[PDB]
Amino acid sequence: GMTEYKLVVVGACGVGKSALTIQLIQNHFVDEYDPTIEDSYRKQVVIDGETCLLDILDTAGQEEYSAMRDQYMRTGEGFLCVFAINNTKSFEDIHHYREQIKRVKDSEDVPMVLVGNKSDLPSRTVDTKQAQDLARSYGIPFIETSAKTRQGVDDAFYTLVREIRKHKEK
Numbered sequence: 001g002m003t004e005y006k007l008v009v010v011g012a013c014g015v016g017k018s019a020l021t022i023q024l025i026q027n028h029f030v031d032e033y034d035p036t037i038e039d040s041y042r043k044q045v046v047i048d049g050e051t052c053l054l055d056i057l058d059t060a061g062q063e064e065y066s067a068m069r070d071q072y073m074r075t076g077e078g079f080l081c082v083f084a085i086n087n088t089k090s091f092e093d094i095h096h097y098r099e100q101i102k103r104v105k106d107s108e109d110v111p112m113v114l115v116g117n118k119s120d121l122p123s124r125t126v127d128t129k130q131a132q133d134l135a136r137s138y139g140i141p142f143i144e145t146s147a148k149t150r151q152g153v154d155d156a157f158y159t160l161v162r163e164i165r166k167h168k169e170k
Protein backbone atom coordinates (compact mmCIF):
# COMPACT_ATOMS: atom_id res chain seq x y z
CA GLY A 1 0.00 0.00 0.00
CA MET A 2 0.91 3.65 -0.42
CA THR A 3 2.52 5.09 2.71
CA GLU A 4 1.12 8.39 3.96
CA TYR A 5 3.43 10.86 5.71
CA LYS A 6 1.88 13.45 8.04
CA LEU A 7 4.05 16.58 7.90
CA VAL A 8 3.47 19.72 9.98
CA VAL A 9 4.77 23.16 9.00
CA VAL A 10 5.38 25.49 11.95
CA GLY A 11 6.96 28.87 12.61
CA ALA A 12 6.06 32.53 13.16
CA CYS A 13 3.27 34.20 11.26
CA GLY A 14 4.63 35.67 8.04
CA VAL A 15 7.58 33.36 7.46
CA GLY A 16 5.97 31.66 4.44
CA LYS A 17 4.46 28.43 5.77
CA SER A 18 1.46 28.72 3.49
CA ALA A 19 3.51 29.86 0.50
CA LEU A 20 5.80 26.88 0.93
CA THR A 21 2.92 24.45 1.31
CA ILE A 22 1.09 25.84 -1.73
CA GLN A 23 4.25 25.66 -3.83
CA LEU A 24 4.40 21.95 -3.01
CA ILE A 25 0.65 21.48 -3.61
CA GLN A 26 -0.11 23.80 -6.57
CA ASN A 27 3.40 24.23 -8.06
CA HIS A 28 2.58 27.97 -7.93
CA PHE A 29 3.77 30.86 -5.75
CA VAL A 30 0.89 32.42 -3.83
CA ASP A 31 1.99 35.75 -2.37
CA GLU A 32 -1.30 36.18 -0.49
CA TYR A 33 -3.01 33.51 1.60
CA ASP A 34 -5.25 34.35 4.59
CA PRO A 35 -2.84 34.31 7.54
CA THR A 36 -5.53 32.72 9.77
CA ILE A 37 -6.21 29.62 7.62
CA GLU A 38 -4.85 26.47 9.24
CA ASP A 39 -5.59 23.43 7.09
CA SER A 40 -4.15 20.23 5.69
CA TYR A 41 -3.47 19.39 2.08
CA ARG A 42 -2.57 16.07 0.44
CA LYS A 43 -0.46 15.32 -2.61
CA GLN A 44 0.99 12.16 -4.12
CA VAL A 45 4.69 12.52 -4.87
CA VAL A 46 7.51 10.27 -5.98
CA ILE A 47 10.39 10.29 -3.50
CA ASP A 48 13.31 8.00 -4.32
CA GLY A 49 11.11 6.14 -6.81
CA GLU A 50 8.42 5.32 -4.23
CA THR A 51 5.04 7.00 -4.66
CA CYS A 52 3.83 8.26 -1.31
CA LEU A 53 0.99 10.40 -0.04
CA LEU A 54 1.99 13.57 1.78
CA ASP A 55 -0.50 15.10 4.22
CA ILE A 56 0.74 18.60 5.03
CA LEU A 57 -0.67 20.55 7.96
CA ASP A 58 0.00 24.25 7.40
CA THR A 59 -0.35 25.72 10.88
CA ALA A 60 -1.76 29.17 11.61
CA GLY A 61 -3.49 31.21 14.25
CA GLN A 62 -3.22 31.71 17.95
CA GLU A 63 -0.82 29.89 20.25
CA GLU A 64 -2.89 27.61 22.51
CA TYR A 65 -1.83 24.78 24.84
CA SER A 66 -5.12 22.95 25.22
CA ALA A 67 -5.16 19.15 25.15
CA MET A 68 -7.08 19.36 21.86
CA ARG A 69 -4.38 21.38 20.09
CA ASP A 70 -1.64 19.16 21.51
CA GLN A 71 -3.43 16.12 20.12
CA TYR A 72 -3.75 17.75 16.69
CA MET A 73 -0.02 18.54 16.48
CA ARG A 74 0.76 15.09 17.91
CA THR A 75 -0.61 13.54 14.71
CA GLY A 76 2.46 14.94 12.93
CA GLU A 77 5.21 12.47 12.15
CA GLY A 78 7.68 15.14 11.05
CA PHE A 79 7.95 18.90 11.38
CA LEU A 80 9.31 21.75 9.29
CA CYS A 81 10.46 24.58 11.55
CA VAL A 82 10.40 27.64 9.34
CA PHE A 83 11.95 31.08 9.84
CA ALA A 84 12.49 33.91 7.33
CA ILE A 85 16.09 34.90 6.61
CA ASN A 86 15.18 38.61 6.80
CA ASN A 87 13.41 38.36 10.17
CA THR A 88 15.59 37.83 13.22
CA LYS A 89 12.61 37.44 15.56
CA SER A 90 11.28 34.49 13.56
CA PHE A 91 14.69 32.78 13.94
CA GLU A 92 14.82 33.49 17.68
CA ASP A 93 11.34 31.88 17.96
CA ILE A 94 12.56 28.54 16.55
CA HIS A 95 13.68 27.09 19.87
CA HIS A 96 10.17 27.53 21.29
CA TYR A 97 8.60 25.60 18.42
CA ARG A 98 11.18 22.84 18.76
CA GLU A 99 10.58 22.61 22.52
CA GLN A 100 6.84 22.25 22.02
CA ILE A 101 7.30 19.56 19.37
CA LYS A 102 9.57 17.55 21.68
CA ARG A 103 6.99 17.92 24.47
CA VAL A 104 3.96 16.88 22.46
CA LYS A 105 5.77 13.96 20.78
CA ASP A 106 7.40 13.05 24.13
CA SER A 107 10.60 12.35 22.26
CA GLU A 108 14.02 13.91 21.93
CA ASP A 109 14.20 12.36 18.43
CA VAL A 110 11.37 13.81 16.33
CA PRO A 111 11.96 13.99 12.55
CA MET A 112 12.54 17.68 11.85
CA VAL A 113 14.12 20.06 9.35
CA LEU A 114 15.14 23.67 9.94
CA VAL A 115 13.96 25.84 7.03
CA GLY A 116 15.26 29.31 6.20
CA ASN A 117 12.73 30.78 3.82
CA LYS A 118 12.70 33.91 1.62
CA SER A 119 16.20 33.10 0.26
CA ASP A 120 15.31 35.08 -2.86
CA LEU A 121 15.32 38.39 -0.90
CA PRO A 122 18.37 40.61 -0.44
CA SER A 123 17.48 41.88 3.05
CA ARG A 124 19.15 39.05 5.01
CA THR A 125 19.48 39.52 8.76
CA VAL A 126 20.11 35.88 9.80
CA ASP A 127 23.49 34.56 8.67
CA THR A 128 23.53 31.17 6.95
CA LYS A 129 26.28 30.12 9.37
CA GLN A 130 24.13 30.85 12.41
CA ALA A 131 21.24 28.84 10.96
CA GLN A 132 23.51 25.95 9.96
CA ASP A 133 24.96 25.97 13.46
CA LEU A 134 21.49 25.84 15.07
CA ALA A 135 20.58 22.84 12.93
CA ARG A 136 23.87 21.29 14.01
CA SER A 137 23.01 21.97 17.67
CA TYR A 138 19.76 20.07 17.12
CA GLY A 139 21.29 17.34 14.93
CA ILE A 140 18.91 18.05 12.06
CA PRO A 141 19.18 19.22 8.46
CA PHE A 142 19.02 22.88 7.41
CA ILE A 143 17.48 23.76 4.06
CA GLU A 144 17.42 27.21 2.44
CA THR A 145 14.13 27.75 0.60
CA SER A 146 12.24 30.32 -1.43
CA ALA A 147 8.53 29.75 -1.93
CA LYS A 148 8.73 32.46 -4.59
CA THR A 149 11.26 30.69 -6.83
CA ARG A 150 10.76 27.08 -5.60
CA GLN A 151 14.34 26.94 -4.31
CA GLY A 152 14.64 24.17 -1.76
CA VAL A 153 10.94 23.29 -1.58
CA ASP A 154 11.17 19.61 -2.51
CA ASP A 155 14.44 19.39 -0.58
CA ALA A 156 12.71 20.49 2.62
CA PHE A 157 9.66 18.27 2.39
CA TYR A 158 11.43 15.25 0.89
CA THR A 159 14.24 15.38 3.46
CA LEU A 160 11.61 15.28 6.18
CA VAL A 161 10.05 12.17 4.60
CA ARG A 162 13.49 10.58 4.51
CA GLU A 163 13.95 11.48 8.19
CA ILE A 164 10.62 9.84 9.04
CA ARG A 165 11.57 6.65 7.20
CA LYS A 166 14.89 6.44 9.07
CA HIS A 167 13.11 7.07 12.40
CA LYS A 168 10.51 4.38 11.63
CA GLU A 169 13.37 1.94 10.90
CA LYS A 170 14.96 2.56 14.33
Ligand SMILES: C[C@H](Oc1ccnc(-c2noc([C@@]3(C)CCCc4sc(N)c(C#N)c43)n2)n1)[C@@H]1CCC[N@H+]1C
Pocket residue numbers: 010012059061062063064065066069070073093096097100101104
Ligand atom coordinates in the same frame (compact mmCIF):
# COMPACT_ATOMS: atom_id res chain seq x y z
C1 LIG B 1 7.08 31.78 19.60
C2 LIG B 1 5.88 32.05 20.47
O1 LIG B 1 4.76 32.48 19.65
C3 LIG B 1 3.98 31.53 19.08
C4 LIG B 1 2.96 31.99 18.24
C5 LIG B 1 2.20 31.00 17.67
N1 LIG B 1 2.40 29.69 17.89
C6 LIG B 1 3.40 29.38 18.74
C7 LIG B 1 3.56 27.92 18.86
N2 LIG B 1 4.39 27.35 19.69
O2 LIG B 1 4.22 25.95 19.42
C8 LIG B 1 3.30 25.91 18.45
C9 LIG B 1 2.87 24.58 17.88
C10 LIG B 1 1.84 24.83 16.77
C11 LIG B 1 4.14 23.88 17.30
C12 LIG B 1 3.97 22.38 17.12
C13 LIG B 1 3.78 21.72 18.47
C14 LIG B 1 2.67 22.42 19.19
S1 LIG B 1 1.76 21.67 20.46
C15 LIG B 1 0.77 23.07 20.66
N3 LIG B 1 -0.22 23.12 21.57
C16 LIG B 1 1.16 24.07 19.77
C17 LIG B 1 0.50 25.33 19.77
N4 LIG B 1 -0.04 26.34 19.82
C18 LIG B 1 2.26 23.70 18.94
N5 LIG B 1 2.86 27.05 18.07
N6 LIG B 1 4.22 30.25 19.34
C19 LIG B 1 6.11 33.18 21.48
C20 LIG B 1 7.03 32.80 22.64
C21 LIG B 1 6.11 32.41 23.75
C22 LIG B 1 5.11 33.50 23.67
N7 LIG B 1 4.86 33.66 22.20
C23 LIG B 1 4.37 35.02 21.83
Ligand SMILES: Nc1nc2c(ncn2[C@@H]2O[C@H](COP(=O)(O)OP(=O)(O)O)[C@@H](O)[C@H]2O)c(=O)[nH]1
Pocket residue numbers: 011012013014015016017018019020030031032033034035117118119120121145146147148149
Ligand atom coordinates in the same frame (compact mmCIF):
# COMPACT_ATOMS: atom_id res chain seq x y z
N1 LIG C 1 9.99 37.11 -1.40
C1 LIG C 1 9.34 36.13 -0.71
N2 LIG C 1 8.19 36.39 -0.09
C2 LIG C 1 7.66 35.29 0.49
C3 LIG C 1 8.16 34.00 0.50
N3 LIG C 1 7.30 33.16 1.19
C4 LIG C 1 6.32 33.94 1.58
N4 LIG C 1 6.48 35.24 1.19
C5 LIG C 1 5.68 36.37 1.62
O1 LIG C 1 5.68 36.40 3.02
C6 LIG C 1 4.39 36.83 3.51
C7 LIG C 1 3.78 35.78 4.40
O2 LIG C 1 3.63 34.54 3.68
P1 LIG C 1 2.64 33.42 4.21
O3 LIG C 1 2.76 32.28 3.28
O4 LIG C 1 1.33 34.00 4.47
O5 LIG C 1 3.25 33.08 5.65
P2 LIG C 1 2.66 32.22 6.88
O6 LIG C 1 1.99 33.21 7.80
O7 LIG C 1 3.90 31.60 7.49
O8 LIG C 1 1.72 31.20 6.27
C8 LIG C 1 3.54 37.13 2.28
O9 LIG C 1 3.60 38.52 2.00
C9 LIG C 1 4.22 36.29 1.20
O10 LIG C 1 4.10 36.87 -0.09
C10 LIG C 1 9.39 33.74 -0.14
O11 LIG C 1 10.02 32.68 -0.18
N5 LIG C 1 9.92 34.88 -0.73
Ligand SMILES: [Mg+2]
Pocket residue numbers: 017018019033034035036037058059060
Ligand atom coordinates in the same frame (compact mmCIF):
# COMPACT_ATOMS: atom_id res chain seq x y z
MG1 LIG D 1 -0.30 30.82 6.52
